[PDB]
Design a protein around this ligand. Structure first.
Ligand code: HEA
Ligand code: HEA
Ligand SMILES: [Cu+2]
Ligand SMILES: [Cu+2]
Ligand SMILES: [Cu+2]
Ligand SMILES: [Mg+2]
Lengths: 47, 109, 43, 56, 227, 61, 49, 261, 43, 514
């Protein structure tokens, strides 16, 4: 198995640059929290 | 074992005997103390003695000091227990040249 | 549980940044949509 | 009839560093890609339909 | 009805609702006992430097803590069940009213003698006269005789609805194709409010219930002037 | 309106100072491009001086 | 060697404790929140006809 | 480490789970298109990728067990448990439908005529074809057993012969049941009697087809000498599933065809 | 017919699909200019 | 490579990580939905609109938190991560199938998201009861999509239930009896069984609902002789086991956390603890009807169900008291996880005590469909199931990642969330005793105070889940690698270091047969 091992390597996202990570976490959790808001908006704009 | 229980005097004896084994090694010395500490009691001076002497046999000064610290910690809020112990251990303490944690200043932060 | 010191420590400034960003990413989008609710309710 | 499981055992035990779903040849590969293609396309098509149906 | 900053149940307008208040007090007294007992034991456990991390014998204490909860449950169960049967009790009503839930209004039917039936709709907060309750006033109150055993029969003509009136300690779902029965018995005149207690669509929150209880005499004259 | 003049300053001290203290914690790093930019005075002298002057002084000969 | 808490502990505790109570008291009163407390004892009933 | 010393199977990364998950998406949303925007293209693609996935996923399993020898005793004991458990979840699936049936037939609503079978429904006769379907399924129970016994005794021809007889009886039932549906004087739309009948006997029908393609697969694996007199879980399972199927029919017969009609 | 079919041949087929696959795309492009589907134009 | 590792996995650790990632994200969506709910109820009037758009929101809140956050995290996340490690197994019994379980989830979630977009979404309540859920009162693809989402999520969970039971039973060291496996493993083995037996009945129910609205059947339609109540029985037969399926793995994690931070070797009364969960799991199957007290059933049967429901308090009691007994002589360590464990013990007690009240049919008549029941289940879910998830997450994070969290920050996070949830749900006991119904977008003027306070608490909770995201970021940004772990003699999961290698127990574990 050419699967790398150890801290920061057993995850599907890069943890090498703390700020790239910051961006990714922000989009990840961010898009998840915003979805309901935009769905309600979408429903409010129909007819 | 199961259902079979000892009286206090037997418990103590069993411990004094344990610590007195001449060919006792470091492992058994650690096991014994580490085990004794899981119980609901501050060990009798006589058990502590045997352990302090075992420390001497193994030329281990530091463990002898840590043993006394444990005795105090185990007394919890019962201030009167430690001094009485040290009192009964005074002879051995002097004979073996063992310093109390208080004397070494290890009781301060 | 013991651990080695941080290989790449995060100074307070760095934390303050990550904390602010983390907050904004949650509060902004929702705030915007919520801010315009009436416009939606009136088409 | 035949009985040639012995040939296949050998074929599949061959140390070619291939995953079982490909260890068997070229067809395994085309089947794989066809399957994968249909799935992804289908998934794309489905997303389109939902975007389409979301609207009045 | 419910007033501002209320903590417990609405005041009992009928006897089973009284009976319930007392049972709840009983039950609540116990949840206070247990919930405070647990909290005390917890803080007790976390407040000593003394240790005993070796093995501890279970089972022995395990009976105390298994037999005790068992006794307490009987102490709740008994009263509970008694009231339960007391509700589904053999009574003889002197009137039978029917109510039919509809998508966003209830309709009542008094049909023992004459075919009297009307619709009860919520008064739009816009057309409320001063002193009228925002989401609780209905245009046609269901008038009934105080101090009398009435038999209500709840059903629906569409989705599920639930006819409830807390002060009287009543709640019965309204299931299409079904006739659920309940005994109403107010022991005092007045206006008693309730609301649809079942999700039924867009205006689920806007289809209230208002009981108006007057003496027989006024009940019958009302009934006639109603057709 | 009036607060903005102060808060922007405060952001200045907080960011610059926490950053500056973070410079104090070992860990060698190498410069990012923004550092090289803003510390090369915007590159501006090193391009607007080595270039047009060359084309002219060349052109003038 | 004093830790983050030895030096800042009191500062944080206090300033934090202060900010909290300041902002909440304001929101709870300085804006238009309708708490709708019980009228019993505070409201004088007017005839409604 | 490096070389394992436990008797388990470390399966190679497979794209099939992803492929089958995507398939479920396609079939479900595809049914939604068929039911609402009248389209089957999506439903068609899903059924397709789904067969593709099952074929391959099971092809590999065969490869790993018969050709590669990963099915050690410990691995097999685990497969037995899995099958049992699966059959169990199925038993509870059918239980929703018998609950439904009994609920309706034991307390017939007035809109039905306050009786069972509801007025207007002309139930089939249990003593006619239903009785036949019963005897067919039951016989395949004895013949699949004969097959199993021949296999353990290494009797190639006979196991094949019995497995064949078993399979045709399963098909015979499918056809017979198919005709019953077509001749039935009631439909899915005939109130609760039709609902109750067509979905219970219907889901069971689907199961007889699923069980028959399974036995067919077993048939061919045997033609190819895959099974040894001692290691043939693929057959054990096919056999267990097949019995689950007779048993469900026995309850259907007695409950819906006999008692509730 | 039977002779052409072989266990060995698969790599060529896989290779052919890409070239074939690439070739297939060209026709759609080629057909589309002539076809002029409004939908194709919309794409 | 990435594909092979992350899309084509057969690794219990990686699949488990994939779950935690899915659960955390879904947890964001559910939190957003819970905020719109309190946003709408935080001031007398209508913010969004009619009970349809509102109830669409309430419905998605329930489905998301129950099926997409709690279940994936506890069973798929911790289940897959820890089980094999705790019994010394190389992996699970069916590595491939295990992967399908996970991949069935994102599509399932899509169908649910899609349902609230097309038409007017599904404003049916998480119970999606007919006639409201039918093709008349709820025409369109919405409910159908809600149903299909549930089918997939169910297929996913019973496939995994099959995997855990097989693994747990069949893959322990030859000398290890079942009465030698840890409480967490027992906890998921039992939860797995509840899923195997309840989930299929649900699928039977909603499939009947699906045909009723697309194939002209009348299982729940009086017209054809159907019965809307029949759906209630089927749904609730699954519906109750479902909540125990939700708290059991939590019970297990709590047993592990309390024991570890008490410095004890094992939990007090291990066999009593096994007995307790088994009893809880069983009684949980014969009490469904307590959810139907105001439906018109026979007084006698109504009496049976209140009694049957009450005896569940006994075994649950032996567990609460056992965790207390575990703390007894312990050398307590006030770590974040221990803080979560203590909160759970109390809060869960209160919430379950409050459920004993509702166990009474007589009293439930006036308590049913009110906010009292909303308080009951949020105490056992928001400060029960969730507190276990947080304690387990902060406790095992180092094992999963290899990095450590900032304990102080982690403690701040507990403080904030503890205040938030209590302020949110405490008032709701009153609103319910005083009559405020469930599923209302607006309420009579009297209920204004408590609803206001309640909504404010939900904003504090928002603050806490935002801070947590940061807390995870910082952990990964700083990179303090784990060195030493205590009590590993009695906690196998940690013996292979943090994080354990892709392949653990390649060479078994040696266990003597005394
Ligand atoms: C994980 C979640 C969870 C858990 C564990 C429970 C546990 C219990 N719940 Fe449940 N409940 C919900 C979540 C949960 N519930 C949900 C989601 C709903 C609403 C669904 C809907 O309709 O939308 C609900 C609804 C609900 C109802 C119906 C309300 C109505 O709509 O009318 C009832 C009534 O019986 C009930 C009762 C109970 C009981 C008796 C327990 C017991 O398990 C409690 C056991 C705990 C204790 C008893 C405390 C600890 C024990 C002791 C300290 C021993 C000593 C104590 C005594 C002697 C009392 N619950
Ligand atoms: C898991 C179960 C769950 C949880 C945790 C919650 C949490 C919340 N819910 Fe609840 N809710 C339900 C399940 C849940 N809910 C259900 C079943 C219903 C019934 C629906 C119906 O009536 O049909 C309901 C109904 C419901 C109502 C009643 C609406 C009505 O009937 O009119 C309200 C209103 O206040 C509400 C509010 C909230 C709030 C304020 C939170 C807040 O406490 C949320 C706080 C935020 C969190 C606790 C999530 C943070 C945790 C994570 C994000 C995990 C992070 C991941 C890692 C660490 C790896 N919910
Ligand atoms: Cu209604
Ligand atoms: Cu309603
Ligand atoms: Cu329940
Ligand atoms: Mg209800």
């Amino acid at each position: 198995s050419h699967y790398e091992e150890g801290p920061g390597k057993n995850i599907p996202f890069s943890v090498e640059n703390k700020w790239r990570l910051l961006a990714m976490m922000t989009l990840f959790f961010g898009s998840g929290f915003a979805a309901p808001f935009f769905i309600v908006r979408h429903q409010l704009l129909k007819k | 074992s199961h259902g079979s229980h000892e009286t206090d005097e037997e418990f103590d004896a069993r411990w004094v005997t344990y610590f007195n084994k001449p060919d006792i090694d470091a492992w058994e010395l650690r096991k014994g103390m580490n085990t004794l500490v899981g119980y609901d009691l501050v060990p009798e001076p006589k058990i502590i003695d045997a352990a302090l002497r075992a420390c001497r046999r193994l030329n281990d000064f530091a463990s002898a000091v840590r043993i006394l610290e444990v005795v105090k910690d185990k007394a919890g809020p019962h201030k009167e227990i430690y001094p009485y112990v040290i009192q009964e251990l005074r002879p051995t303490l002097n004979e073996l040249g063992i310093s109390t944690p208080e004397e070494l200043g290890l009781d301060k932060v | 549980i013991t651990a080695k010191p941080a290989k790449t420590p995060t100074s307070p400034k760095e934390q303050a940044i990550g904390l602010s960003v983390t907050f904004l990413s949650f509060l902004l989008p929702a705030g915007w949509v919520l801010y315009h609710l009436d416009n939606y309710k009136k088409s | 009839f035949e009985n040639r499981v012995a040939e296949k055992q050998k074929l599949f035990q061959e140390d070619n560093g291939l995953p079982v779903h490909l260890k068997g040849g070229a067809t395994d590969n085309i089947l794989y890609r066809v399957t994968m293609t249909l799935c992804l396309g289908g998934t794309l098509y489905s997303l389109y339909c939902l975007g389409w149906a979301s609207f009045p | 009805m419910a007033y501002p900053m209320q903590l417990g149940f609405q005041d009992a307008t009928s006897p089973i609702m009284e009976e319930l208040l007392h049972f709840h007090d009983h039950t609540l007294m116990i949840v206070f006992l247990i919930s405070s007992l647990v909290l005390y034991i917890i803080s007790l456990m976390l407040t000593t430097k003394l240790t005993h991390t070796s093995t501890m014998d279970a089972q022995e204490v395990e009976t105390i803590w298994t037999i005790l909860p068992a006794i307490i449950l009987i102490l709740i169960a008994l009263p509970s069940l008694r009231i339960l049967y007391m509700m589904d009790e053999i009574n003889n009503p002197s009137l039978t009213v029917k109510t039919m839930g509809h998508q966003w209004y209830w309709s009542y039917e008094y049909t023992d003698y004459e075919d009297l039936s009307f619709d009860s709709y919520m008064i739009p907060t816009s057309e409320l006269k001063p002193g009228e309750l925002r989401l609780l006033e209905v245009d046609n109150r269901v008038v009934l005789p105080m101090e009398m055993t009435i038999r209500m029969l709840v059903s629906s003509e569409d989705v599920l609805h639930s006819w409830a009136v807390p002060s009287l300690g009543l709640k019965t779902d309204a299931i299409p194709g079904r006739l659920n029965q309940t005994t109403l018995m107010s022991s005092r005149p007045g206006l008693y409010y309730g609301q649809c207690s079942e999700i039924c669509g867009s205006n689920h929150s806007f289809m209230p219930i208002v009981l108006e209880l007057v003496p027989l005499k006024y009940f019958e004259k009302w009934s006639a002037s109603m057709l | 309106m009036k607060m903005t003049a102060l808060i922007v300053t405060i952001m200045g001290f907080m960011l610059a100072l926490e950053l500056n203290n973070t410079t104090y914690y070992l860990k060698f790093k190498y410069p990012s491009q923004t550092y090289k930019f803003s510390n090369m005075l915007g590159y501006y002298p090193s391009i607007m001086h080595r270039l047009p002057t060359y084309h002219n002084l060349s052109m003038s000969q | 060697a004093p830790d983050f808490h030895d030096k800042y502990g009191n500062a944080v505790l206090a300033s934090g404790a202060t900010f909290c109570v300041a902002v909440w008291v304001y929101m709870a009163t300085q804006i238009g929140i309708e708490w709708n407390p019980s009228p019993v004892g505070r409201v004088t009933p007017k005839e409604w006809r | 480490m490096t070389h394992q010393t436990h008797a388990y199977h470390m399966v190679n990364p497979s794209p099939w789970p992803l492929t089958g998950a995507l398939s479920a998406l396609l079939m479900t949303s595809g049914l939604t298109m068929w039911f609402h925007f009248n389209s089957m293209t999506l439903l068609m693609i899903g059924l397709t990728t789904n067969m593709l996935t099952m074929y391959q996923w099971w092809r590999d399993v065969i490869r790993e067990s018969t050709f590669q020898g990963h099915h050690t005793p410990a691995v097999q004991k685990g497969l037995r448990y899995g099958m049992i458990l699966f059959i169990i979840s199925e038993v509870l699936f059918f239980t929703g439908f018998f609950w439904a049936f009994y609920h309706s037939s034991l307390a017939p609503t007035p809109e039905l005529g306050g009786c069972w079978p509801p007025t207007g429904i002309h139930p089939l006769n249990p003593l006619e074809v239903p009785l036949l379907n019963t005897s067919v399924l039951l016989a395949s129970g004895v013949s699949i057993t004969w097959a199993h016994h021949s296999l353990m005794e290494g009797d190639r021809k006979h196991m094949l012969q019995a497995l064949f007889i078993t399979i045709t009886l399963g098909v015979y039932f499918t056809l017979l049941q198919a005709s019953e549906y077509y001749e039935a004087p009631f439909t899915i739309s005939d109130g609760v009697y039709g609902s109750t009948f067509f979905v219970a006997t219907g889901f069971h029908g689907l199961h007889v087809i699923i069980g028959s393609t399974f036995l067919i697969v077993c048939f061919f694996r045997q033609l190819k000498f895959h099974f040894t007199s001692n290691h043939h879980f693929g057959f054990e399972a096919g056999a267990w599933y097949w019995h689950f199927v007779d048993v469900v029919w026995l309850f259907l017969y007695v409950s819906i065809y006999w008692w509730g009609s | 017919l039977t002779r052409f079919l072989g266990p060995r041949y698969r790599q060529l087929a896989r290779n052919w699909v890409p070239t074939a696959s690439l070739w297939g795309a060209v026709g759609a492009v080629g057909l589309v200019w002539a076809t002029d589907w409004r939908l194709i134009l919309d794409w | 490579m990435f594909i092979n590792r992350w899309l084509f996995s057969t690794n219990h650790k990686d699949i488990g990580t994939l779950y935690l990632l899915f659960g955390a994200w879904a947890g964001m969506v559910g939190t957003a939905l819970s905020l719109l709910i309190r946003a709408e109820l935080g001031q007398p009037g209508t913010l969004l609109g009619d009970d349809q758009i509102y109830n669409v929101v309430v419905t998605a809140h329930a489905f998301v938190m129950i099926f997409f956050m709690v279940m994936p995290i506890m069973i798929g996340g911790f289940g897959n991560w820890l089980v094999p490690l705790m019994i010394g197994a190389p992996d699970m019994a069916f590595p491939r199938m295990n992967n399908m379980s996970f991949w069935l989830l994102p599509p399932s979630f899509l169908l649910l998201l899609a349902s609230s977009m097309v038409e007017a979404g599904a404003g049916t309540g998480w119970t999606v009861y007919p006639p409201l859920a039918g093709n008349l009162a709820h025409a369109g693809a919405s409910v159908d999509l809600t149903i299909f989402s549930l089918h997939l999520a169910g297929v996913s969970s019973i496939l995994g239930a099959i995997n855990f039971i097989t693994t747990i039973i069949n893959m322990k060291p030859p000398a290890m009896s079942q009465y030698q496996t840890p409480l967490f493993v027992w906890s998921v083995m039992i939860t797995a069984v509840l899923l195997l037996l309840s989930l299929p009945v649900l699928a039977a129910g909603i499939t009947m609902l699906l045909t009723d609205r697309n194939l002209n059947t009348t299982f729940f339609d009086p017209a054809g002789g159907g019965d809307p109540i029949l759906y209630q029985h089927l749904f609730w037969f699954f519906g109750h086991p479902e909540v125990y399926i939700l708290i059991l793995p939590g019970f297990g994690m709590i047993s592990h956390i309390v024991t570890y931070y008490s410095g004890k070797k094992e939990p007090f009364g291990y066999m009593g603890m096994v007995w307790a969960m088994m009893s809880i799991g069983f009684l949980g199957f014969i009490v469904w009807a307590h959810h139907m007290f105001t439906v018109g059933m026979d007084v006698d049967t109504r009496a049976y169900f209140t009694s049957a429901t009450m005896i569940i308090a006994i075994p649950t009691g032996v567990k609460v008291f056992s965790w207390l007994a575990t703390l007894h002589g312990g050398n307590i360590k006030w770590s974040p996880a221990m803080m979560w464990a203590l909160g759970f013990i109390f809060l869960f007690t209160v919430g379950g005590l409050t459920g004993i009240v509702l166990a009474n049919s007589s009293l439930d008549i006036v308590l049913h469909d009110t906010y009292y029941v909303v308080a009951h289940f949020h105490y056992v879910l928001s400060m029960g199931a969730v507190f276990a998830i947080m304690g387990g997450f902060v406790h095992w994070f180092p094992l999963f990642s290899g990095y450590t969290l900032n304990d102080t920050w982690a403690k701040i996070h507990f403080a904030i969330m503890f205040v938030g949830v209590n302020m949110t749900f405490f008032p709701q006991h009153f609103l319910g005793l005083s009559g405020m119904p469930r599923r209302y977008s607006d309420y009579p003027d009297a209920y204004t105070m408590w609803n206001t306070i309640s909504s404010m608490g939900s904003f504090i909770s928002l603050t806490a889940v935002m801070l947590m995201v940061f807390i995870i970021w910082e952990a990964f940004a700083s990179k303090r690698e784990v060195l030493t772990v205590d009590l590993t003699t009695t906690n196998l999961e940690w013996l292979n270091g943090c994080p354990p290698p892709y392949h653990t127990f390649e060479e078994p574990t040696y266990v003597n047969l005394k």
